[PDB]
UniProtKB/Swiss-Prot annotation:
Record's protein name: Angiogenin
Modified residues (Pyrrolidone carboxylic acid): Q1
An example Gene Ontology molecular-function term: ribosome binding
Residues annotated as catalytic: H13 (proton acceptor), H114 (proton donor)
Family: Belongs to the pancreatic ribonuclease family.
Role according to the record: Secreted ribonuclease that can either promote or restrict cell proliferation of target cells, depending on the context. Endocytosed in target cells via its receptor PLXNB2 and translocates to the cytoplasm or nucleus. Under stress conditions, localizes to the cytoplasm and promotes the assembly of stress granules (SGs): specifically cleaves a subset of tRNAs within anticodon loops to produce tRNA-derived stress-induced fragments (tiRNAs), resulting in translation repression and inhibition of cell proliferation. tiRNas also prevent formation of apoptosome, thereby promoting cell survival.
Clinical note on disease: Amyotrophic lateral sclerosis 9: A neurodegenerative disorder affecting upper motor neurons in the brain and lower motor neurons in the brain stem and spinal cord, resulting in fatal paralysis. Sensory abnormalities are absent. The pathologic hallmarks of the disease include pallor of the corticospinal tract due to loss of motor neurons, presence of ubiquitin-positive inclusions within surviving motor neurons, and deposition of pathologic aggregates. The etiology of amyotrophic lateral sclerosis is likely to be multifactorial, involving both genetic and environmental factors.
Gene name linked to the record: ANG
Naturally occurring in which organism (per UniProt): Homo sapiens (Human)
Presence of the UniProt keyword Methyltransferase in the record: no
Gene Ontology cellular component annotations, sorted alphabetically: actin cytoskeleton; angiogenin-PRI complex; basement membrane; chromosome; cytoplasm; cytoplasmic stress granule; cytosol; endocytic vesicle
Location of this fragment in the whole protein: 25 to 147 of 147
Known outcome of mutating K54R: Found in a patient with Parkinson disease; uncertain significance
Effect of F100I: In ALS9; uncertain significance
Keywords per UniProt: Amyotrophic lateral sclerosis, Angiogenesis, Cytoplasm, Developmental protein, Differentiation, Disease variant, Disulfide bond, DNA-binding, Endonuclease, Hydrolase, Neurodegeneration, Nuclease, Nucleus, Protein synthesis inhibitor, Pyrrolidone carboxylic acid, Secreted, Signal, Stress response
Disulfide bonds: C26-C81, C39-C92, C57-C107
Length: 123
């Protein structure tokens, strides 16, 4: 809330660079950040520059996309960890599907406060 809304989104999403781009990394980070209780079905850990993340809401390094969504021009490394556990409750087996592509971070107030997992629905 109020500047920390963005980096609540970046607690969950922004993990500046992983251990590796694999399922042991994504089970580890989902455990430690704790979207593991209950298991989040799909969540992308974004990796890159934090300066780049904020600058997606700038018009220089991110285009406006309809109604306040901001599609990036500086594609980020994005490990889209999808749950292939089966259990909704912990433990959660996360299979990492690593890709590198542009995020649609939804921006309020000059801060990307959110990010659609609409792109990252089926990685």
């Amino acid at each position: 809330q109020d500047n920390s809304r963005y980096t609540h989104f970046l607690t969950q999403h922004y993990d500046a660079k992983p251990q590796g781009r694999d399922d042991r990394y994504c089970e580890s980070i989902m455990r430690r950040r704790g979207l593991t209780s209950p298991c989040k079905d799909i969540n992308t850990f974004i990796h890159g520059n934090k300066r780049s993340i904020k600058a997606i809401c700038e018009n220089k390094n991110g285009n406006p996309h309809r109604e306040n969504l901001r599609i990036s021009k500086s594609s980020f490394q994005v490990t889209t960890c999808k749950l292939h556990g089966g259990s909704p409750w912990p433990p959660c087996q996360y299979r990492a599907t690593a890709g590198f592509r542009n995020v649609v971070v939804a921006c309020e107030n000059g801060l990307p406060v959110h990010l659609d997992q609409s792109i990252f629905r089926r990685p």
